[PDB]
Design a protein around this ligand. Structure first.
Ligand SMILES: O=c1[nH]cnc2c1ncn2[C@@H]1O[C@H](COP(=O)(O)O)[C@@H](O)[C@H]1O
Ligand SMILES: O=c1[nH]cnc2c1ncn2[C@@H]1O[C@H](COP(=O)(O)O)[C@@H](O)[C@H]1O
Ligand SMILES: O=c1[nH]cnc2c1ncn2[C@@H]1O[C@H](COP(=O)(O)O)[C@@H](O)[C@H]1O
Ligand SMILES: O=c1[nH]cnc2c1ncn2[C@@H]1O[C@H](COP(=O)(O)O)[C@@H](O)[C@H]1O
Ligand SMILES: O=c1[nH]cnc2c1ncn2[C@@H]1O[C@H](COP(=O)(O)O)[C@@H](O)[C@H]1O
Lengths: 354, 354, 354, 354, 347
């Protein structure tokens, strides 16, 4: 009697099956795309949130081979100034970043978020003049007249900039944004760590199924999809890629880095940095904090180490193979309990595990 | 070998799928029906419980555009006097309530509960003489000879009053109450926060399936169904509507408001009001308390904000569309864990989330 | 690739569906059978455990209309003396027990357990001479050469006594014990509260499926089945009956009564009595304690009140109808969470709920 | 849309069904094989981990009728010296070990692990010269060019030694190692108590399905499979055998024995020994400790008592029957809750249960 | 061998002894002095902290018959502007603290830093009633000299100096011309001075030692910090205080700076030390200031009823304490019963 379209799965519902391997984890390729026009050397994007990405973290993300999306919870002039900081940043003396995401002019790549409200035309124009590489039309519900028409307008008005539209969670939404001319789509309704959309509105799609449905819809187009939200462990990243993601966007994972906005807060013997939803104070997110994690480079190293391991296990030599060839098994709650550490009292944990 | 009719789902088993939207949350219509003859401007009913609805809260519910059902755990004269308080209440001076539920004479609408025991004939007569808009024949098991015959008797004896029968949880029960002449049916066996029917009797139907089964049964009749119990978050309300409910009845959500009976109780630095099952002291409910929530208006605002968001997400312009067009996905335990806030230490929560 | 016969369910996996009712809970019939030859006025049996049933509790069980099975963890003379105490017990003065389980001579009914070891022939003979109504050939694995041959031997050697064989959990086991001449079979491998068989041996069948499989096997024979173990709430009892049980055996529920062996133990402001597995100190059970519950009569009243409610809800006028006509829905973990009390801080609980 | 090969199960998803039994637990046979050429009197192997198996524990394992695999986290000379200790060990005076695993010369059997890195050729040669019975080519991903080629090389170079390859979790991996000439395959990707592969890489297969898939693949070959990891209770061992394992490898279960490396550590009134992953400090395991368990002989006695019970319950007279004839039921989370001790306050636990 | 001057006590070390009473709680007088020139109708002062007192709370404090001290963690123009907001505020408040021109009274804190001279000038120009030379260590050359400077340069303005905890410090500030002294080294809820520096004096003994030194000087003393219960306020008065300054008790009010934060079923507002020798936190939301004041003053009236003190002068000088042990304090609190409903004045 219920109108149920499908059962939908998320990360903890599935595991990757090992396959025959001849390429070691250290030798696989991690190169992928953010959009039709923008390549990334590693499949990582930092979230457009005011506790995650401003110039400092965006510089670091690009240096690592990913990219940062500067948040829009600031004045237009201020957001453009952040973009300019990234574009003008020069590599120091003796430091070298062989994987750095750079444009044709050799400048670090950066993105920036806009909405669909009254200041959007001016905001986009300012960001484009500041040299932004990609404009992210970023709302809670990308499958809407407002977002579709704004994506079209950016493509027409500023023909040399890349455009991402989101967020979405269905095949029909993916086709609608592709029809608007999006250079990539961003996938995720509700899975974010600090997000309460699924609880307050009762709306969303478990992220592994969301990713796969969007990936299938975009087959034949060459338009990338960005899997946004819900990543807690490096293994989730691997699963997202095999479900069809071209890259992943994370907020919580990066909010605790030195390069993220904010200062270290001490509490009960541990160190933290603040992390809050952008729809937080009828709110659809809350406010919190995450453990301090040190330099971004160390978090990236752990994440990519885990992804490289997964590619080693599945026998995937590069991202295109990882996206299209490995298989999942579906598991139960007991399968997941067995996956975690179990029946031993931990005394010393790992940087990549709790 | 087991006689199992179906797998049955409740709120946490499903999520709403986003759809194409052109109508903003602030612009959708929330109008619906309580019964064949009674319209509501918002789909909210307060429970007929002695810790939830007496005159003060019923006045407020009607002013907000919903309705209150005055409980029957009091003398007949006393219950009629509560009804009269609501009917005679006049709007103050400078306060205006544009959505107020009013009868043809401009008086605030109110309902009242009766059972099937010996004082029922007199109780109904007194409530009708007091100007009650709807008599709720309210028992633990509406699919029974007693309730069916009493619903018939009220329809025959007092032809100008609306009648609700309940509670039920099946298609055949819905048809039986409709055949008795009910102007609406009330759905819910066991899901109430303080209810222990499912534990003590082993009886009940998960509420999302209960709602959908009753909705399908009543197709072609124009008889509304009221989804009673189990609502914890505004997202549950959205799900109930898409499963086919015309409106929802809540007890726990309203027991903590200023307008509910009882005084604020202080305990471990927080404020509470009492909340107890009507089958509490072989009991089928227990006794407890819920956090103080302040004015009813603020709770209603949060609930309707969440419902408006859900309608925005599904592209539903009004309640009839919301009831009949959006789809669910079925999810697992991990899907639900991903829906809640996860993997972040909360520091500041939201009025609509914990 | 796995040899899996079926998915198997237990109590928390299912709920009873309400049906049309014309018979009130106070008016239904609870009469049933323990064995081909022994009627019970209520479907309750107390477990043959040394912390549950000796003469005092067996007397009370019979007086209530059920029956007690005296445990075998004592000398043969001692076990026979316990049986004699029950048979010789006379009702006091002004107390009357209208439902008492009595034999043709007007004496209270009682059962007693035996195993299959070396003292079994003498033990059975002593119990029969003491006037026992039913010999329970009681082992961990009733589907065995030893139990089958001992059941046959008792039927041949002592032709006037009833015989129960167990424990079993399959259709083929039920047919094998029926072929041995059992007057009833006892169902339950692993579900007992203090039992660790399923953990230590990895063996067992979820009890609702076990009951239904055995009930289907015994159709056409008139041989009762006794559902032994795993009952925690009165609702579980209702579910067991609808799955096909003729009656239920409980240990934990009765161990805390005044009539059970042992004295009240005080600990952290609460009162307890001891309760331990019979395979406890390679053990297959452990040792513990359960809350003190007062007179057995109060526990029976709560259990039967819950069963009467369930029969009222399903429209079952008597046990035969309850066993054969009502339906289940299968539920998820969220369905069960909704069944329990949820999202309210309990202040006063109920005798039948926690 | 997702590429899902199957639903996969682990231990807590299934239970063994009782069957007709004529052979008592004390009378069944536990004999099995480690490899084509090596018989074991009991189906137990100790893990090749530096907190589990060195000479002392390997001696004890062999004396009990199983075998130990000496770990490779030590110099080549040192690992060979450990092997020599086992081979040269003579039984004392008045102690007798009737089940001892011995080679043709009457010496205790022992295995040793190697990897695929640069020191492997020399390490294998040294272990073989030291008299090792079986070389375990042991890596995180046995389905790889490196492991396959190394297994071939050992078979060719040292034709008189047995070779195990692993770890694997699929049918195709099993066929690939069998084609390389492996004398047994070791099954397990991620289930180990201290392992974090499934979390960090997102890779693995629930162990009961892994075992069954490998068992089916190896039908017709006579090549044993060793079920490595995830065993927490003796019942898990029984389940592993019925899924098709020839024997099981355990680390956590043995790390707390007196014979394991390391000294007793006292903490909060209890005794512990250290236990850590071999991929612990991008780590794929962590570090911890497990309760002290005393002599290995007592743990073996409990494990085999549980397996004997399971064989008694299923009517399996020997390991070959246990592997091929009994059936499972699939269960839910509630089935598992019912399997554990429930609804009783434990006061005295058992050596084989918590 | 240790140079120990005395054993020192604080609030939980003592209890007030009941005495013969003829004046009911509702009939006692709560009037007192803030400074030798300024009178208050209730003995309450709000702390000069950026999470406690700005214009809004200061207005409410004055209206209740106490006074607020505007904090100095803001620009000079900003602080003077806060003072003017209070001085210009118009309304019934029968107990309201007002100056000779009928304007609400307000205080403002200064330090001894470089801009102090300018800050004082601006505040005085804004019509401030009292300048609080407010530092962690009032018994210092710097503070004593600044107090003297203010009394020279603007002798028309009342001056408070602090903080101090000894007889010698009290006499030094009185000599410098202070119109009141403020007592408290380390007892504040959020303060860590006693832990980080190892320095301080338990507040009851600090108050009593200062009160003895100031007998006959005409100089009132303000007991600043460590008040958790209304009973503490009563104790502080009997130990010799003329009034009490609180931060934590007021930070959770509607009138205090900041907004409500929700966390684990309760509501909170932020509270942090001005110093590090302090930490940062939050306190339960308590609603209107008027409610807190009512409870505090009800507790004080009850204590005065119990001791038979008809006014503040008697309360400061006549009642006695007993010294109690840890078991004595355990008996004083609720004990051996599971609370189900607590009280606004007892959590
Ligand atoms: O206030 C919010 N409500 C709903 N979603 C949010 C909010 N803030 C951030 N998000 C989403 O959550 C993602 C981050 O998820 P995370 O990596 O799981 O922490 C963002 O990239 C956004 O898509
Ligand atoms: O004592 C009781 N037993 C069973 N159900 C109850 C009892 N009291 C109230 N209810 C039901 O529970 C609903 C309220 O559920 P809630 O909104 O989840 O708190 C009521 O409208 C009633 O249908
Ligand atoms: O030591 C034991 N091991 C396994 N099962 C037991 C043991 N002791 C009692 N039982 C079973 O557990 C049942 C009682 O279960 P309960 O009503 O859930 O407490 C008994 O009637 C027996 O069938
Ligand atoms: O650091 C590690 N990472 C992954 N797996 C490990 C690690 N260390 C040991 N294992 C595996 O875990 C098994 C032991 O699992 P256990 O019996 O569940 O404690 C070993 O035999 C190895 O197969
Ligand atoms: O950072 C700080 N260090 C030391 N003392 C402080 C600090 N902040 C405030 N105080 C003091 O603590 C008092 C407030 O104490 P409370 O009433 O116990 O919360 C203030 O009036 C100040 O005297």
């Amino acid at each position: 009697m219920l109108r149920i379209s499908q059962e939908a799965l998320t990360f903890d519902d599935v595991l990757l099956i090992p396959g025959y391997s001849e390429v070691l984890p250290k030798d696989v390729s991690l190169k992928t795309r953010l959009t039709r026009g923008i390549e990334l050397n590693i499949p990582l994007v930092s979230a457009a949130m005011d506790t995650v990405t401003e110039a400092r973290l965006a510089i670091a993300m690009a240096q690592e081979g990913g990219i940062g999306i500067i948040h829009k919870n600031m004045g237009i002039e201020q957001q453009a100034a952040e973009v300019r900081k990234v574009k003008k940043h020069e590599t120091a003396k003796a430091k070298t970043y062989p994987l750095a995401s750079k444009d044709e002019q050799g400048r670090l790549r950066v993105g920036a978020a806009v909405g669909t409200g009254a200041d959007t035309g001016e905001r986009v124009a300012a960001l484009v003049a500041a040299g932004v590489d990609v404009v992210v039309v970023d709302t809670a519900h990308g499958h809407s007249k407002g977002v579709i028409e704004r994506v079209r307008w950016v493509k027409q008005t500023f023909p040399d900039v890349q455009v991402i539209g989101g967020n979405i969670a269905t095949a029909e939404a993916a086709k609608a944004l592709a029809e608007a001319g999006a250079d990539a789509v961003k996938v995720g309704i509700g899975p974010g760590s600090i997000c309460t959309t699924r609880i307050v509105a009762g709306v969303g799609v478990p992220q592994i199924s969301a990713i796969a449905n969007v990936a299938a819809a975009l087959e034949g187009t060459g338009v990338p999809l960005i899997a946004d939200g819900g990543i807690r462990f490096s293994g989730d990243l691997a699963k997202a890629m095999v479900a069809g993601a071209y890259c992943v966007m994370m907020g919580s994972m990066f909010a605790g880095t030195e390069e993220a906005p904010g200062e270290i807060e001490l509490f009960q013997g541990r160190s933290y940095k603040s992390y809050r939803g952008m729809g937080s104070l009828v709110p659809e997110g809350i406010e919190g904090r995450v453990p301090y994690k040190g330099a971004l480079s160390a978090i990236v190293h752990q994440l990519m180490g885990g992804l490289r391991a997964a590619m080693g296990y599945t026998g995937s030599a590069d991202i295109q193979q990882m996206r299209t060839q490995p298989q999942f098994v579906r598991i139960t709650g007991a399968g997941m309990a067995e996956s975690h550490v179990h029946d031993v009292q931990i005394t010393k944990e790992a940087p990549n595990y709790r």
